[PDB]
Structures are given as C-alpha cells and as structure tokens.
Amino acid sequence: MELKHSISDYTEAEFLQLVTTICNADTSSEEELVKLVTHFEEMTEHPSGSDLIYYPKEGDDDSPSGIVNTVKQWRAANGKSGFKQG
Numbered sequence: 001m002e003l004k005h006s007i008s009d010y011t012e013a014e015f016l017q018l019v020t021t022i023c024n025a026d027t028s029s030e031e032e033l034v035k036l037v038t039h040f041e042e043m044t045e046h047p048s049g050s051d052l053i054y055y056p057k058e059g060d061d062d063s064p065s066g067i068v069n070t071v072k073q074w075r076a077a078n079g080k081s082g083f084k085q086g
Contacts, residue, residue: 007043007075011084015043016068023053023064044071044080 007015021027022036034050041049048055052070056062075082 003039006081007071007083008081009084010043011086012068012072013086015071015083016065018043019053019068020064023062023067044074045078046071046074 004010010018018036019040022033022040025033027033027036037050037053040046040052046052052067053062053064060066074080
C-alpha cells in the first residue's frame with residue numbers, strides 16, 4: 001500500500017510527477033517504469049491508459065506534462081473525479 005487509491009491522492013502536480021518518472025524513465029529499472037504506467041491506468045482509468053505515454057499523436061509530444069495535461073482534460077470528458085487539492 002505504499003501507493004495511494006486513485007488520482008484523488010495525487011494532485012495535478014504529484015500525478016504529473018508520476019507520468020514523468022515513467023516517460024522520462026527516472027526509475028532504477030524498466031520494470032518499475034511499467035508498473036508506473038499501469039498505475040497511471042488505474043488512476044484516471046484513461047482509455048489509452050499506458051498509451052497516453054506510449055501513444056504520442058503523430059506531430060504532438062510524448063512529454064509527461066502533455067500526457068498529464070491530457071488526463072486533466074480527460075477527467076472532464078469522462079467527468080471523472082480529479083487530482084487532490086492544490
């Protein structure tokens with residue numbers, strides 16, 4: 001349980017930090033980078049899930065801020081919850 005429950009436990013920055021440790025790959029192993037992305041999936045339940053990082057539009061950017069900026073708008077379309085408090 002070292003993690004949290006959903007995106008509500010991660011603010012728009014604490015969560016944007018997660019997608020960074022994944023895309024940027026700041027972990028100490030590629031396996032932890034996957035468990036990092038799959039986790040992203042269980043957070044915003046995004047449909048692409050790990051695609052938001054492994055699915056950069058042909059002409060856009062795969063950076064972490066553009067992917068967390070992507071969910072930020074997703075949660076609105078999906079009318080999901082949102083990050084913690086900022």
